[PDB]
Design an enzyme around this catalytic site. Sequence first.
Site, PDB file in Angstrom:
ATOM      1  CG  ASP A   1      -1.296   2.721   6.514  1.00 59.02           C
ATOM      2  OD1 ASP A   1      -1.682   1.528   6.665  1.00 59.02           O
ATOM      3  OD2 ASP A   1      -2.047   3.723   6.499  1.00 59.02           O
TER       4      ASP A   1
ATOM      5  NE  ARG B   1      -3.783   5.633   0.661  1.00 62.10           N
ATOM      6  CZ  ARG B   1      -3.675   5.194  -0.591  1.00 62.10           C
ATOM      7  NH1 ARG B   1      -3.546   6.050  -1.598  1.00 62.10           N
ATOM      8  NH2 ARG B   1      -3.648   3.890  -0.832  1.00 62.10           N
ATOM      9  CG  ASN B   2      -0.374   4.624   2.878  1.00 68.08           C
ATOM     10  OD1 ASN B   2      -0.653   3.635   2.206  1.00 68.08           O
ATOM     11  ND2 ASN B   2      -1.288   5.324   3.538  1.00 68.08           N
TER      12      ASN B   2
ATOM     13  CG  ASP C   1      -1.944   1.160   1.166  1.00 68.93           C
ATOM     14  OD1 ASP C   1      -2.688   1.328   2.147  1.00 68.93           O
ATOM     15  OD2 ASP C   1      -1.996   1.900   0.156  1.00 68.93           O
TER      16      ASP C   1
END
Lengths: 280, 282
Positions: free
Chosen positions: B160, B146-147, B142
């Site tokens: 994350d 954003r991570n 992922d």
Amino acid sequence: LPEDPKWEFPRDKLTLGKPLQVVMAEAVGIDKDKPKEAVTVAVKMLKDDATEKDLSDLVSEMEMMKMIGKHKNIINLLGACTQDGPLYVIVEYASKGNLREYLRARRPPEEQMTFKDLVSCTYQLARGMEYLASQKCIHRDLAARNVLVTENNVMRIADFGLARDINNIDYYKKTTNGRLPVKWMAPEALFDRVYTHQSDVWSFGVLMWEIFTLGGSPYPGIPVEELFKLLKEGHRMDKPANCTNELYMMMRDCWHAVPSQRPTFKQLVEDLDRILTLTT
Amino acid sequence: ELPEDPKWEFPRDKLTLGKPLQVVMAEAVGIDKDKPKEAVTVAVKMLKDDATEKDLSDLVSEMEMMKMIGKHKNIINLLGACTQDGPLYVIVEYASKGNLREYLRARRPPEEQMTFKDLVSCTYQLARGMEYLASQKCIHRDLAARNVLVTENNVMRIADFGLARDINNIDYYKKTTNGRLPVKWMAPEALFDRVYTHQSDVWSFGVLMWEIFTLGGSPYPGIPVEELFKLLKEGHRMDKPANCTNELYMMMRDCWHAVPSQRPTFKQLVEDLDRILTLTTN
């Protein structure tokens, strides 16, 4: 994605708008009888960061609503854009928002809720669920947050993302019922990996507690991590203040450990119908 | 119902929860076994009230993955957890500047703008992060702007790990494999062949690179996820972000090679970025 002429809606007649992933929209002639009137509807679609499962889920939610019929107390499907573009699931628009928010809203210091209201609100939802149960459909995600209230303060059960036909459940398989919010979930749904209508009444009971607490948070102070052990040991929420002993006894009945020992929605409907008339 | 890991366990009474950043800021007093009196600012991830069984098993899995991954400059690191008698609390390093996606959009030409070098250093750092992560038989799965969190000193830390798996903990070929990965960052083999490797991460890394040079742009703008893969198998690929050299764009395009092996390795990415960044300083 198969072509379903019956539900398809012309994309050029649909005008998306402010968000409510769900957004408010203007659907022109979505009403087969008023071909030129633009109806304000709600449109559910995937998010930019959507995952494969999200889509499979969205598709399933739609199909589910297609199977479930119409009813005054359940948000109905108005159509869907499914070919040549994003998947849009057009559903009726509930002006007042969702029940949990609506309730916390008019909590005594915006027009405070009366007793009869709560009962009515409760009664409505019971009929909505009785109907669903008769359609051989299990919601699996029943809760205040998932109830929407129309402009006429009517209760409409929403969120069918996790609803299944009673027979479409993987009985006894480890992965079953693992996406259901623990606090509203029936014990068996986990301790036996099964889900029946009696599992929805358990949930319904938790809903009642919310309704009569005007948006309270179930099992306050108890982390989901240590809930089920308490449940198993017999723990059950307390009678909410501003609630009839009778009604609390109904809440407690929906929480009977043994599923067959919990009332059915048909029963809940009658009892509620009765109490409601008397209140009047 | 949760085994005890004394080395990672943290005195629940030494932690003081606070504002939310489910993850919230907190004060871990003496979390550092080299200043047992100092209250360190940390971040705590925990289940929400409407959590499900999957959310819990997922949070636990994330914590275990962070225990396996060693310590590295460009990786968010685990500082301990409260796993006995009470909600599960995963205590992780607190990054003050928050996540990269917003951080970038924030300093978009009318905080302080990003120089070309800053974008490159950023990319270079993350590659080292991934390179390491890969050196540990760990696949992130992922990867996205954003991570990524960014510290006070603007250090990039890959966060994350809720979907990170050991290289061997993937069911190759099962319909359900990789079905929870955000599609606009996911490598085609992930879905089509139901597998996932490090070269799958470089593909992801590529979309990340694009996000960085567009200062937090949104991948495949105007394209529904439902139509993306068709366009991808068709050959579609994002355009050179504005204010991005053709060298770096050719680098992004390489990561998006249909054939996994024809994508660079994280080690290669690191060396090219190291070269680019260095020549930039001159």
